[PDB]
């Protein structure tokens, strides 16, 4: 019941920024968190950031802590990954999934159709 958007995604150049959003239908269930995750190919995927819908509180995967930012717009039921000095290892569909817990993957039951990021040599 939950429809999921993201936008944002493309080509850009390695040391540089890029910010994705999600749009959301609905509120996440069973658990309130909302999170971006990431698959490359040949790989498991990923959890990147998290956060309560609650209360706000944010999670990150240590592959991209202190370069990314996760953040919402209550009014807009959006939230958005800002996502800094990026390097062509962060190169990935990036998903906005809700209604989880942090970033296990296997508790969201609703998932975008993923934006892809591509990040140059
Ligand atoms: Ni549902």
């Known amino acids: 019941q939950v429809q999921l958007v993201e936008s944002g995604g493309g080509l850009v150049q390695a040391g540089g920024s890029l910010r994705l959003s999600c749009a959301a239908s609905g509120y996440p269930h069973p658990y309130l968190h909302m999170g971006w995750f990431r698959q490359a190919p040949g790989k498991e995927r990923e959890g990147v950031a998290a956060m309560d819908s609650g209360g706000g509180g944010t999670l990150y995967a240590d592959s991209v802590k202190g370069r990314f930012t996760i953040s919402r717009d209550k009014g807009k039921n959006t939230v958005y990954l800002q996502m800094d000095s990026l390097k062509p290892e962060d190169t990935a569909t990036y998903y906005c999934?809700?209604?989880?817990?942090?970033?296990?993957?296997?508790?969201?039951?609703?998932w975008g159709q993923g934006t892809q990021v591509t990040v140059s040599s």
């Open positions: 999934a809700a209604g989880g817990y942090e970033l296990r993957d296997r508790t969201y039951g609703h």
